[PDB]
Amino acid sequence: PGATLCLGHHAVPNGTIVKTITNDRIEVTNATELVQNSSIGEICDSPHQILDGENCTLIDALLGDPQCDGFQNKKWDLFVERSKAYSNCYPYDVPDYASLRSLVASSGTLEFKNESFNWTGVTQNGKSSACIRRSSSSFFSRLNWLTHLNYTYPALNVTMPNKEQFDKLYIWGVHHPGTDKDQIFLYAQSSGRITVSTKRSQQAVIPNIGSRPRIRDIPSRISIYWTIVKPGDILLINSTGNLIAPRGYFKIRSGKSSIMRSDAPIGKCKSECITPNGSIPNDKPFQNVNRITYGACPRYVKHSTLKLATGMRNVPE
Amino acid sequence: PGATLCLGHHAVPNGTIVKTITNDRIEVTNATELVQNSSIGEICDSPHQILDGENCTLIDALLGDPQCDGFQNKKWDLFVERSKAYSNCYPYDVPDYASLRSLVASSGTLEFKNESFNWTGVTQNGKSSACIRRSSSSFFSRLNWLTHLNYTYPALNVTMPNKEQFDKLYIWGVHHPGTDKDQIFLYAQSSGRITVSTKRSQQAVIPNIGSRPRIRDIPSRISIYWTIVKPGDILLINSTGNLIAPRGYFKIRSGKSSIMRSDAPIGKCKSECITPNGSIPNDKPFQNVNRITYGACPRYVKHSTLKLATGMRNVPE
Amino acid sequence: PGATLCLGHHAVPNGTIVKTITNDRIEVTNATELVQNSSIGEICDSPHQILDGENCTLIDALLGDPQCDGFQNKKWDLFVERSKAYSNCYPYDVPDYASLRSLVASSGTLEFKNESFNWTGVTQNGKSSACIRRSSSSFFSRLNWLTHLNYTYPALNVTMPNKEQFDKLYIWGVHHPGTDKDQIFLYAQSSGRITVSTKRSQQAVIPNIGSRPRIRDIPSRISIYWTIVKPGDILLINSTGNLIAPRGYFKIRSGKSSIMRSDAPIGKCKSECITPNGSIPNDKPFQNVNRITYGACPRYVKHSTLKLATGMRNVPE
Amino acid sequence: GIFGAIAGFIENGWEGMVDGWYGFRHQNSEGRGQAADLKSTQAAIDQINGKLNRLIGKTNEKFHQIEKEFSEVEGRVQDLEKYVEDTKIDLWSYNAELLVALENQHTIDLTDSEMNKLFEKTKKQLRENAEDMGNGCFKIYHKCDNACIESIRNETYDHNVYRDEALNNRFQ
Amino acid sequence: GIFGAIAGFIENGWEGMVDGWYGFRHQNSEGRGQAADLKSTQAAIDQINGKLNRLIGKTNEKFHQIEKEFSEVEGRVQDLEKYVEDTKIDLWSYNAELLVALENQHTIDLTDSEMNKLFEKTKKQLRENAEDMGNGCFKIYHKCDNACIESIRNETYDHNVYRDEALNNRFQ
Amino acid sequence: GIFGAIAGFIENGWEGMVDGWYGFRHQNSEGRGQAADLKSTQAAIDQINGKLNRLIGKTNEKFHQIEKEFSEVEGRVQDLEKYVEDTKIDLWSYNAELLVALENQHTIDLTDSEMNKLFEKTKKQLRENAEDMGNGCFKIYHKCDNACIESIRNETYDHNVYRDEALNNRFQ
Ligand SMILES: CC(=O)N[C@@H]1[C@@H](O)[C@H](O[C@@H]2O[C@H](CO)[C@H](O)[C@H](O[C@@H]3O[C@H](CO)[C@@H](O[C@@H]4O[C@H](CO[C@]5(C(=O)O)C[C@H](O)[C@@H](NC(C)=O)[C@H]([C@H](O)[C@H](O)CO)O5)[C@H](O)[C@H](O)[C@H]4O)[C@H](O)[C@H]3NC(C)=O)[C@H]2O)[C@@H](CO)O[C@H]1O
Ligand SMILES: CC(=O)N[C@@H]1[C@@H](O)[C@H](O[C@@H]2O[C@H](CO)[C@H](O)[C@H](O[C@@H]3O[C@H](CO)[C@@H](O[C@@H]4O[C@H](CO[C@]5(C(=O)O)C[C@H](O)[C@@H](NC(C)=O)[C@H]([C@H](O)[C@H](O)CO)O5)[C@H](O)[C@H](O)[C@H]4O)[C@H](O)[C@H]3NC(C)=O)[C@H]2O)[C@@H](CO)O[C@H]1O
Ligand SMILES: CC(=O)N[C@@H]1[C@@H](O)[C@H](O[C@@H]2O[C@H](CO)[C@H](O)[C@H](O[C@@H]3O[C@H](CO)[C@@H](O[C@@H]4O[C@H](CO[C@]5(C(=O)O)C[C@H](O)[C@@H](NC(C)=O)[C@H]([C@H](O)[C@H](O)CO)O5)[C@H](O)[C@H](O)[C@H]4O)[C@H](O)[C@H]3NC(C)=O)[C@H]2O)[C@@H](CO)O[C@H]1O
Ligand SMILES: *[C@@H]1O[C@H](CO)[C@@H](O[C@@H]2O[C@H](CO)[C@@H](O[C@@H]3O[C@H](CO[C@H]4O[C@H](CO)[C@@H](O)[C@H](O)[C@@H]4O)[C@@H](O)[C@H](O[C@H]4O[C@H](CO)[C@@H](O)[C@H](O)[C@@H]4O)[C@@H]3O)[C@H](O)[C@H]2NC(C)=O)[C@H](O)[C@H]1NC(C)=O
Ligand SMILES: *[C@@H]1O[C@H](CO)[C@@H](O[C@@H]2O[C@H](CO)[C@@H](O[C@@H]3O[C@H](CO[C@H]4O[C@H](CO)[C@@H](O)[C@H](O)[C@@H]4O)[C@@H](O)[C@H](O[C@H]4O[C@H](CO)[C@@H](O)[C@H](O)[C@@H]4O)[C@@H]3O)[C@H](O)[C@H]2NC(C)=O)[C@H](O)[C@H]1NC(C)=O
Ligand SMILES: *[C@@H]1O[C@H](CO)[C@@H](O[C@@H]2O[C@H](CO)[C@@H](O[C@@H]3O[C@H](CO[C@H]4O[C@H](CO)[C@@H](O)[C@H](O)[C@@H]4O)[C@@H](O)[C@H](O[C@H]4O[C@H](CO)[C@@H](O)[C@H](O)[C@@H]4O)[C@@H]3O)[C@H](O)[C@H]2NC(C)=O)[C@H](O)[C@H]1NC(C)=O
Ligand SMILES: *[C@@H]1O[C@H](CO)[C@@H](O[C@@H]2O[C@H](CO)[C@@H](O[C@@H]3O[C@H](CO[C@H]4O[C@H](CO)[C@@H](O)[C@H](O)[C@@H]4O)[C@@H](O)[C@H](O[C@H]4O[C@H](CO)[C@@H](O)[C@H](O)[C@@H]4O)[C@@H]3O)[C@H](O)[C@H]2NC(C)=O)[C@H](O)[C@H]1NC(C)=O
Ligand SMILES: *[C@@H]1O[C@H](CO)[C@@H](O[C@@H]2O[C@H](CO)[C@@H](O[C@@H]3O[C@H](CO[C@H]4O[C@H](CO)[C@@H](O)[C@H](O)[C@@H]4O)[C@@H](O)[C@H](O[C@H]4O[C@H](CO)[C@@H](O)[C@H](O)[C@@H]4O)[C@@H]3O)[C@H](O)[C@H]2NC(C)=O)[C@H](O)[C@H]1NC(C)=O
Ligand SMILES: *[C@@H]1O[C@H](CO)[C@@H](O[C@@H]2O[C@H](CO)[C@@H](O[C@@H]3O[C@H](CO[C@H]4O[C@H](CO)[C@@H](O)[C@H](O)[C@@H]4O)[C@@H](O)[C@H](O[C@H]4O[C@H](CO)[C@@H](O)[C@H](O)[C@@H]4O)[C@@H]3O)[C@H](O)[C@H]2NC(C)=O)[C@H](O)[C@H]1NC(C)=O
């Protein structure tokens, strides 16, 4: 009678379709998805240190908007900015706003050290009803509005040396009075001059008097500027008016910190990768959830699915 | 006698050389070119809406250069700028010229709506012989040169609200008189000030008096600026001289529109892809015609030919 | 008895491990490294023309810092800037310093032609003890410090036409006096104005009076600017003070020239590729020495080794 | 497959083989059975696991990067920021889908090869005692009880033991 | 080729076969003819068409982009705009020429495989009735008229019908 | 390998073959020797040299580029300059390591193929005068002196000369 010996392979009733070089629909015994398509819908607070800004932009928490007082001296790996955030102090703008937001975000801290400048002949602590703190007219916590004293404004010339072992970030600004009369009412002359300088940098601003639309009944504006002072360098402020003075410096660190716009809630979980949609698993090498990512993340691609075959061609009976 | 059965393959007398991983010259029965190397030498006017600028730059058609009057309120998918184009109005420059050209090009329209500002105490419709329209001294169609009236220039403070459902693009500017005397002859004082602002932006320009080389016998210059007003926002112009006022706003759209520098003529044909050399077929995935493309286009590479083998190795008899 | 015929392949006792698609550690008979990991530690002066800046930055050699006098009219393919370089003249800064450094580096020359401007009513050749040349107070070689003559400063209006067949690079600047008194001591008025212009460009600078920290006992500052004059165009300087005048123009070429920060010494050898670590061989297609390269160079990757198998799988006895 | 075994001269796979990827089905005087082959199954699984170890859990850490969404019009720099990110995404999208298509073509071909390898190993074992029926099955020309079948699956089969019996049956 | 048939043990191709990519040439008592094989030809053409469908007519739509030519010197931002575009072009130029070189190597190898597949299918059909002459041709050891040749090309050839005649001729 | 010869049915390589990559080892009445095969060795070396000519000495000239190291904080433009260079390096690092992994897989497979090609060529030469022992060796069933062995290595071996002697020894 003899015998018959047959060589063969396995098959499954439920195969998976994959793409190949010669065929874009071919069935294999098994495959695995290489594109992460979903998030858990929330941002895990581990392992990265998450700082929820809630109602505050990072820039507002930097200057000292009253609703952002709880953010003083906070640190973060990822600062989360909400779309509901709003400013609620003196109306201001920042020339190259994105660069300051970027430098503070990558530094990852609001650690602030108060300093005693010699504002001898001026009125400190200028306030306004547009910036309300504890049911009272106030101002940015980290800025010092200087006005005249005895209807005179003396030409300031103040020094601040950097004897630390790190760089200093000074936030200052210039006031833009809405009218030529306000420029007299505040600084007792029509020509304000500002010259902030170090051994490595010089900055000069002139106020621009004119009417802007009113925000919280204020037609005036503030323009924020910043200066970096190296170790061994010296800050030198020389102004005859309209100067929004710094109250001190921020430590500028360098690390893994950044910022992300997201409305996803923060959750109690662990995930290396964060997207504005929420955290995603990072076992797969690709993802189509969001091009904006933070951490050990799969690379963003525009394909919704890419199945890697993990078995032979499926030929069922 | 038996029989002989031979297995074999086909061959051709005229084979094609292709590159492989192990051999850079190997003959196959047939191949297909994957790099488009030629254009038809003209720009097909289908399916994309082509707007030939001819003698006009897009910026000149925006301001209202007399030779560009036919471009008023025109729309386009691709605006074609010719190298022969030239300005022929008041001499001007645009700080960040490329950004304004880019924003108008991507918007894809010159739709303009006239608006009535309250220029109560000034002389409107300032003209010049450098800008000739219909054998007569004229000015940019969309700009309003304001000068003194009765040898006085009153400090202007004009408002324009945005009650529409779209953003507004306002084009304005500042006049730079060639001499200190011209600054008196035009605006009846030596200090011009300009402050264009909204609730989201502020811009301040001071004229710079001085002699520039003469273009059409004009040593003065205009510097063009722009401002975007959001729905619900308000435009606020506050100036004491040298203001080139806006006559209205442009609609800023968002779509597939752009701009391309090309001297190729426009033809009556259909082609999805446009290059400055002219339209190219887009059946192939690569092309070495031009790195500048518009539409569904093959990707630019620096290889002149890449033949994909479509047959077996050719072994002729 | 018959015979036995065995088919087989070679093997070696000393195989090499390589990576594959299915196995990241597989032994082959022989391999070759595709990632260049080392440099010779010096920059070969062939075939590229190397210009060692030593103590001088390219910008300092441009202006005319006394220790950089030996760099006058020099050309280069690669200008090498040392980290030990230091400025030793009047304290200055350059708005958009990197762009001027880039344009001079890519031009590849300091060829300078002196020109006679009509500085009729002013005192030329202003000097300072911060810029010492031959044990004597001096100034930047290519710049002309103009001050008052007979306690008056006449409004300058000087022309310089470009009748050459190449573009001209003019380096000029503005003086920022430390005090309002110095502005009188130097230019006999409190308001300096500067307007450098051509038919294609306009630039306007106002001095910013104020105290900066002292460098070589100078609280004043200079701000350097540049202007390009096309063939057929005309330079036009119109100033009433604080003008650091140009003494001529530089030729702006276009070629293969660039600049590299490196402390590696220059050697007597030949190598197409230069990195800040020194020259590297370019036989391999990749390298992990430095992302900064000049010349025919292997592409930078972040892998320390990538062995390409040049033999079969090694199966020893 | 490029080797012509799977979906080739083997008409279909065995849904009933759940303990191996390749194996034997026999028919002798003692019945008909099925058994999986360990070496060939492990060879295919090892190769596929080598691909997975290259792709699974091998992500890159990126922290502070550029902005990628914009609410307002700005101009030149924003155009470049968008163009840089769009350029990067297109290149990685090309890398990703080309990688999967190439690996799937190779995975199908390497699994086809292991099947062909096992068939050739079995054919060489039988020498002149069997003939290829063309569908992946061998006609064995001698009495091959269960122990004889296991000796083929265990690579201990001696063709000389059954050669005279087989050659006699083959050449009637 | 990596399978060794085309430009391998088959010395050359047939310029006279214009209706197929692979086929048979025979020599029997009734003459000598040529016929193309449908399945193997379609298998190679289908695979190549799958490559073309991935590459032909699959372009990307781009509209407003960055500037790529410049008349005047500007500085930092223009350097980045040029560097971004040059970087992108080099990567796509690498992608394009690597893609063609890889696909051409695979195309030559898959067409070599189909030729080898058809030869193996024919060899298994003939069993002990033919012997491999080494050049892609089979020596058939029995009278095989035209109908017998068509039965091999149509996969209806029964080796048992001619086995006794063939074995007798083979072993003189 | 995907063909199953090297590290497959051939148990190991010959460290003593220093003049060729593939070759023959024989055993006859006159002794046992070793000889390299020229064609198969050159075929593998030519293919590998084709890979090297694509990669060795094919660098790109770049001169003035963007800055890539920064001492001070600047902002938006510096972030893009860093992001552009980091993006480019990651893509070329991906290109480089994927290229090596793909080519090494192909190099191992093409060298495995040449070994399989030479074995098949030898098997077809011997026809019915030899049998496959399964380990890459042929049992030759006739007296094959040194000249007979050289005739196989030189592709001048005539199977008809020894067929009657071989068939007689094979079928006892
Ligand atoms: C002994 C004697 O007689 N001395 C003389 C003085 O009388 C005289 O003082 C000046 O007198 C004029 C007379 O009309 C005027 O009252 C001056 O005060 C300004 O008044 C205007 C109009 O009411 C007011 O503008 C209003 O401001 C509010 C909001 O106000 C605050 C805010 O923002 O909450 C109040 C803050 O304290 C103030 N901040 C500081 C640091 O001073 C700010 C600031 O002034 C503005 O924000 C600047 O833009 O404003 C609201 O916006 C209304 O719409 C707006 O009309 C000004 O704010 C008042 N200025 C001040 C400094 O309070 C008064 O100084 C003196 C000088 O002329 O001459 C002596 O001889
Ligand atoms: C009753 C009485 O006596 N009243 C007094 C007035 O006389 C006096 O008026 C001023 O008198 C002076 C006296 O010399 C002078 O005439 C003033 O007019 C200027 O004249 C200069 C020199 O001719 C002229 O400059 C010339 O301009 C042309 C080109 O001209 C136009 C143009 O561009 O086509 C003409 C346009 O209308 C004008 N645009 C506007 C909006 O006014 C422009 C503009 O002035 C310039 O483009 C600014 O750069 O110029 C050519 O370029 C020549 O090369 C150049 O020399 C000025 O253009 C004249 N200015 C005006 C406004 O026309 C005259 O005003 C009054 C004031 O001093 O005092 C009363 O008491
Ligand atoms: C006949 C008669 O009586 N005529 C009157 C004149 O007396 C009078 O002249 C002015 O008189 C005042 C009186 O105090 C003063 O002396 C003026 O000179 C300035 O003096 C200050 C203080 O000493 C000095 O500042 C010092 O500068 C040094 C460094 O000096 C140089 C340098 O940089 O090396 C010297 C250079 O020549 C000079 N460059 C030029 C082009 O002039 C520069 C330049 O002045 C600065 O670099 C600008 O920042 O300085 C050091 O830095 C010290 O720390 C610093 O205090 C000024 O430099 C002196 N100015 C000049 C131009 O030399 C003197 O002009 C006249 C005008 O008031 O009135 C007549 O009636
Ligand atoms: C250049 O031109 C602009 C034109 O807008 C001027 O700016 C305007 O200035 C006026 C004052 O001069 C501002 O008017 C103030 O606005 C508030 C309006 O509140 C009422 O109306 C809004 C809707 O419009 C309602 O939501 C609100 O509930 C109120 O019904 C008032 O708060 C102000 O005072 C009011 O209360 C006081 C106290 O009771 C009364 O004395 C007043 O009469 C009034 O009732 C005041 O009316 C206006 O807002 C400004 N607009 C903008 C856009 O800024 C610039 O001032 C001008 N330049 C110069 C130099 O003057
Ligand atoms: C950085 O900071 C420094 C100071 O730290 C500023 O420099 C000071 O600013 C001004 C510059 O214009 C100087 O003040 C001026 O004083 C002059 C009057 O001189 C007085 O002293 C002399 C001494 O002999 C007497 O003879 C004379 O009678 C005066 O008593 C005038 O130009 C101005 O004074 C005005 O007001 C006074 C007081 O009411 C009136 O009596 C006068 O008539 C006049 O109307 C002016 O105030 C001051 O001296 C400078 N100091 C130094 C050391 O130079 C910088 O300006 C500042 N920089 C910036 C950018 O802010
Ligand atoms: C700072 O310095 C610059 C120096 O250039 C001054 O600018 C110059 O100003 C003068 C007038 O002061 C301008 O001269 C004018 O130019 C025209 C020249 O036309 C003739 O020449 C050209 C070739 O150069 C030919 O192509 C042309 O066909 C003519 O042959 C004239 O049109 C002007 O007037 C002419 O006609 C009138 C009427 O007939 C006569 O009254 C005149 O005499 C003359 O014939 C005039 O000559 C010169 O163009 C300006 N150059 C530049 C580069 O701008 C600045 O003015 C100075 N700053 C200050 C504050 O003054
Ligand atoms: C935005 O627009 C607003 C207006 O819409 C501008 O604000 C106006 O600008 C100036 C600011 O300097 C103001 O005008 C000035 O008036 C003063 C004179 O006061 C007159 O009124 C008082 C009222 O009691 C009388 O006592 C007095 O006698 C005057 O009659 C002077 O500083 C100036 O006037 C000059 O000219 C007049 C007329 O010839 C002479 O009689 C004077 O002696 C003097 O030489 C000056 O003209 C005006 O009041 C402001 N309005 C408001 C509401 O504040 C902004 O400046 C503008 N902003 C920008 C950036 O453009
Ligand atoms: C705004 O505020 C700043 C504050 O810094 C002012 O700038 C300072 O101005 C003073 C002069 O007014 C400068 O002082 C000068 O500094 C030198 C110091 O040298 C000694 O000290 C250093 C260490 O500090 C040692 O290394 C050195 O070897 C010395 O021991 C001196 O060279 C100057 O003069 C010296 O010599 C002369 C001649 O013998 C004597 O007359 C002097 O008394 C002194 O001994 C002088 O002392 C100081 O450097 C400035 N600092 C900065 C940071 O710039 C601005 O001037 C002010 N604004 C205005 C308008 O005044
Ligand atoms: C580019 O360069 C040009 C010159 O090449 C500059 O233009 C000159 O600058 C000023 C502009 O203000 C002008 O000079 C001024 O002169 C006036 C006095 O007029 C004199 O001439 C008339 C003629 O009839 C006489 O009647 C009168 O009595 C004067 O003699 C005044 O405004 C100024 O003079 C001051 O000083 C003098 C001398 O001490 C005093 O007698 C006066 O009382 C007064 O206090 C002023 O100096 C000059 O005319 C302009 N030239 C031209 C051709 O326009 C540009 O300003 C310059 N641009 C830049 C940006 O730098």
Numbering used by the authors:
A (entry chain A), B (entry chain A), C (entry chain A): 9 to 325
D (entry chain B), E (entry chain B), F (entry chain B): 1 to 172
Give verbatim excerpts from the published study on this entry.
IAV strains are named according to the antigenic similarity or serotype of two major viral surface glycoproteins, hemagglutinin (HA or H) and neuraminidase (NA or N), which also play key roles in binding and release, respectively, from receptors on airway epithelial cells. Influenza HAs bind sialic acid (N-Acetylneuraminic acid, NeuAc) containing glycans (sialoglycans) on cell surface glycoproteins and glycolipids as their primary biological receptors. Previously, we and others have demonstrated that over time, IAV HAs within the human H3 subtype have evolved more complex receptor specificity, selecting for elongated α2–6 sialoglycans featuring at least three linear LacNAc (galactose linked β1–4 to N-acetylglucosamine, Galβ1–4GlcNAc) repeats beneath the terminal species-defining sialoside moiety. By utilizing a variety of structural techniques, we provide evidence that this enhanced mode of receptor-binding has evolved over many years to include mutations outside the traditionally defined sialic acid receptor-binding site (RBS).
Population-level virus sequencing and other epidemiological data have now shown that, since their emergence, clade 3C.2a and its descendants have rapidly established and largely maintained dominance as the major H3N2 seasonal strains throughout the last decade. Notably, these dominant 3C.2a-descended viruses, harboring superior fitness traits within humans, have almost exclusively maintained the strict receptor-binding length selectivity phenotype observed in prior strains (see all post-2013 strains in Fig. 1). Comparison of complex structures between Ecu/16 and Tex/17, respective representatives of clades 3C.3a and 3C.2a, reveals a potential role for residue 159 occupying a space in close proximity to the reducing end of the 6SLN2 receptor fragment above the RBS. As described, when present as S159, H3 viruses bind similarly to both long and short receptors; however, when present as the alternate commonly observed variants Y159 or F159, the otherwise closely similar HAs bind preferentially to elongated glycans. Alternatively, Mich/14 and Tex/17 structures (both Y159) appear comparatively rigid, with the terminal GlcNAc occupying a similar position to receptor complexes from 2007 & 2010 featuring F159. In these cases, the presence of the larger phenylalanine side chain not only adds additional steric bulk at the top of the HA head, but further forms a conserved stacking interaction with the sugar ring of GlcNAc 7. Consistently, F/Y159-containing species favor binding to longer receptors since additional linear sugars in the receptor chain are potentially capable of extending beyond the 150-loop to avoid steric hindrance. Within these contemporary strains, receptor length selectivity appears to be strongly influenced by single variants at position 159.
